[PDB]
């Protein structure tokens, strides 16, 4: 899809505004709105000058402005704006060299895919994530200097009309798994795409979910553990690799899974805590990664066991042979999370890392001399951030991740880890006020 069709869309729909959208390192979606008459054919080869004071690494204290370069293939009319608006996802570029910014998640995902095609291991990667959310009727939260409080108060029309709006915005939905045990938790299934296209689709997914919940007087949250004792929100990711139109993950070994797939799983397992720094970036994210029942915390693979973090779905077709990693949560930044998973898999393929043996029939039942032995995902955000700081190397292959970008990301996550670490919590008043 080119720019000429975008101008044709502008004239066709009588678009008044164009909303240029990009993503922080935090994953939040930033936008600049320009009038539709400011969009010309030349606008797609210079972009728009932008002031980079966005939170995170973009708050670099030496530098000048950045460039918003739109991707014309991502244009879609916004369903929620009263004045007809055309949404375009943009990359952040350095104004001089006109190259992708080092601290741009979308540019990093594009670099990861380019490095994939460069190494010759595969031609493309297919990602299907399963982001789950919570729908609540109401919620009030706050934390002043004299205390804290939170209070959450828990239809088919909302779910169906979410699916309708998602299909308006170019997503191909194919199910909707409302859950009656742990009521409130929903998940819409969508079709697989490549890495950066699927990350853009996740951003659209969250946008639609939030706004449709708003219009029905509800509140949706993609927060990994919004509520005590009830099951948390996860985002399982199915990965496949394709070269010239055939799976590299289809083979003859365990559960019909190929040798390259086994090294992919080995690479994911080895770096899973550095990955956890990016796939599980919040402190809330580790209140659902606690050892127990149905918790994706054991770093091993099994088609049968459902305590293993890496699952191998059984499909009656060799053309659909993928691996599902289950520890990521929907609070991740899709670009950074997906790039981290891809690079871990590529480092596993490159170094012939063997995962080991399938943990078919060994759940959290605490085997006498195996519960401690099996690798686990990070236990807290500090541990994941420290392991990322130590294990930068697999992210730096091919120049996808800069040391400066990783440093800025880690500092930005730490300034929230510390705010959580130093406030006193009401459960500690319940337990330790008298003590």
Residue 306 labeled ligand binder: yes
Q: How far is the CB of 307 from a second copy (least distance, A)?
A: 10
Chain residues 350-389 in contact with Ni ion, contact rule CB under 5 A: none
Q: How far is the CB of 367 from a second copy (least distance, A)?
A: 16
* Stretch of 110-118, 156-164, 192-200, 348-356 contacting a second copy, by CB under 8 A: 156-164
Residue 288 labeled ligand binder: yes
CB burial of residue 386 (10 Å; 0-12, 13-18, 19+): middle
Q: How far is the CB of 169 from a second copy (least distance, A)?
A: 14
**Measured between alpha carbons, how far is residue 189 from residues 173, 203, 207, 236 in Å?**
6, 14, 15, 11
How many angstroms separate the CA atoms of 427 and 420, rounded? 14
Residue 232 labeled ligand binder: yes
Is 321 among the residues known to form the active site? no
Question: Exactly one of 21, 106, 111, 236 is catalytic; which is it?
Answer: 236
Q: Which of 42, 45, 97, 145 binds a second copy (CB under 8 A)?
A: 145
Q: Which of 89, 106, 225, 236 binds Ni ion (CB under 5 A)?
A: 236
How many angstroms separate the CA atoms of 91 and 103, rounded? 11
Q: How far is the CB of 268 from a second copy (least distance, A)?
A: 22
322 binds Ni ion (CB under 5 A): no
Residue 238 labeled ligand binder: yes
Is 373 among the residues known to form the active site? no
Chain residues 128-167 in contact with Ni ion, contact rule CB under 5 A: 130
Q: How far is the CB of 144 from a second copy (least distance, A)?
A: 8
SS3 sequence of the chain = CCHHHHHHHHHHHCCCEEEEEEECCCCCEEEEEEEHHHCCCCHHHHCEEECCCCCCCCCCCCCCCEEEEECHHHCEECCCCCCCEEEEEEEEECCCCCCECCCCHHHHHHHHHHHHHHHCCCCEEEEEEEEEEEEECEEEEEEECCEEEEEEECCHHHHHHHHHHHHHCCCCEEEECCCCCCCCEEEEEECCEEHHHHHHHHHHHHHHHHHHHHHCCCEEECCCCCCCCCCCCCEEEEEEEEECCEECCEEEEHHHECHHHHHHHHHHHHCHHHHHHHHCCCCHHHCCCCCCCCCCCEEEEECCCCCEEEECCCCCCCCCCCEEECCCCCCCCHHHHHHHHHHHHHHHHHCCCCCCCCCCCCCCCCCCCCCCCCCECCCCHHHHHHHHHHCCHHHHHHHCCCHHHHHHHHHHHHHHHHHHHCCCCHHHHHHHCCC
Is 51 among the residues known to form the active site? yes
Residue 103 labeled ligand binder: no
Number of residues that bind a second copy (CB under 8 A): 97
Chain residues 377-396 in contact with a second copy, contact rule CB under 8 A: 379-380, 382
Question: Exactly one of 78, 91, 132, 329 is catalytic; which is it?
Answer: 132
Tokens of 11: 């004239």
* Stretch of 7-15, 46-54, 366-374, 401-409 contacting a second copy, by CB under 8 A: 46-54
Residue 434 labeled ligand binder: no
Residue 236 labeled ligand binder: yes
Is 167 among the residues known to form the active site? no
Is 63 among the residues known to form the active site? no
370 binds a second copy (CB under 8 A): no
Is 392 among the residues known to form the active site? no
Report yes or no: 249 and 325 within 8 Å, Cβ to Cβ.
no
Is 187 among the residues known to form the active site? yes
Q: Which does 253 bind (CB under 5 to 8 A by kind): a second copy, Ni ion, none?
A: none
Chain residues 166-205 in contact with a second copy, contact rule CB under 8 A: 167, 173-178, 180-181
Chain residues 111-130 in contact with a second copy, contact rule CB under 8 A: none
62 binds a second copy (CB under 8 A): yes
Question: Exactly one of 187, 200, 347, 417 is catalytic; which is it?
Answer: 187
Is 306 among the residues known to form the active site? yes
* Stretch of 106-114, 148-156, 245-253, 267-275 contacting a second copy, by CB under 8 A: 148-156
Q: Which does 236 bind (CB under 5 to 8 A by kind): a second copy, Ni ion, none?
A: Ni ion
Active-site residue set:
51, 130, 132, 179, 187, 236, 306, 324, 326
Q: Which residues are annotated as a binding site for ATP?
A: 174, 238-240, 306, 311, 319
Residues in the site for Ni ion, rule: CB under 5 A? 130, 236
């Amino acid at each position: 899809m080119s720019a000429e069709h975008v101008l044709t869309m502008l004239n066709e729909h009588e678009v008044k505004f164009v909303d240029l959208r990009f993503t922080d390192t935090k994953g939040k979606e930033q936008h600049v709105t320009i009038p539709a008459h400011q969009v010309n054919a030349e606008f797609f080869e210079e972009g728009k000058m932008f002031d980079g004071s966005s939170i995170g690494g973009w708050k670099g204290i030496n530098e000048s402005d950045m460039v918003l370069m739109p991707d014309a293939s991502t244009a879609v009319i916004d369903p929620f704006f009263a004045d007809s608006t055309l949404i375009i996802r943009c990359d952040i570029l350095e104004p001089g060299t006109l190259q992708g910014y080092d601290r741009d998640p979308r540019s990093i995902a594009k670099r990861a895919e380019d490095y994939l095609r460069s190494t010759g291991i595969a031609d493309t990667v297919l990602f299907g994530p399963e982001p789950e959310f919570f729908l609540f009727d109401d919620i009030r939260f706050g934390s002043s200097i004299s205390g804290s409080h939170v209070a959450i108060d828990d239809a088919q029309d909302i779910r169906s009309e979410m699916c309708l709006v998602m299909e308006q915005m170019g997503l191909v939905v194919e199910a909707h798994h409302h859950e009656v045990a742990t009521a409130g938790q929903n998940e819409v299934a969508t079709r697989f795409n490549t890495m950066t296209k699927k990350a853009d689709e996740i951003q659209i997914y969250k946008y639609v979910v939030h706004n449709v919940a708003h219009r029905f007087g509800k509140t949706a949250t993609f927060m990994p553990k919004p509520m005590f004792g009830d099951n948390g929100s996860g985002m399982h990711c199915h990965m496949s690799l394709s070269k010239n139109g055939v799976n590299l993950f289809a083979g003859d070994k365990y559960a019909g899974l190929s040798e390259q797939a086994l090294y992919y799983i080995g690479g994911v397992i080895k770096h899973a805590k550095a990955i956890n720094a990016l796939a599980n970036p919040t402190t809330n994210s580790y209140k659902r990664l606690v050892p127990g029942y149905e918790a994706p915390v054991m770093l091993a693979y099994s088609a049968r066991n459902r305590s293993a973090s890496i699952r191998i779905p059984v499909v009656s077709s060799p053309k659909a042979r993928r691996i599902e990693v289950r520890f990521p949560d929907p609070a991740a930044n899709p670009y950074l999370c997906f790039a981290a998973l891809l690079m871990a898999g590529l480092d596993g393929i490159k170094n012939k890392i063997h995962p080991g043996e399938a943990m078919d029939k060994n759940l959290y039942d605490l085997p006498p001399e195996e519960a401690k032995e099996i690798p686990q995902v990070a236990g807290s955000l500090e541990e994941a951030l420290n392991e990322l700081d130590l294990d930068r190397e697999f992210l730096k292959a091919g120049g996808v991740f800069t040391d400066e970008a990783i440093d800025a990301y880690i500092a930005l996550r730490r300034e929230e880890d510390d705010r959580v670490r130093m406030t006193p919590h009401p459960v500690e008043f319940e337990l330790y006020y008298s003590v």
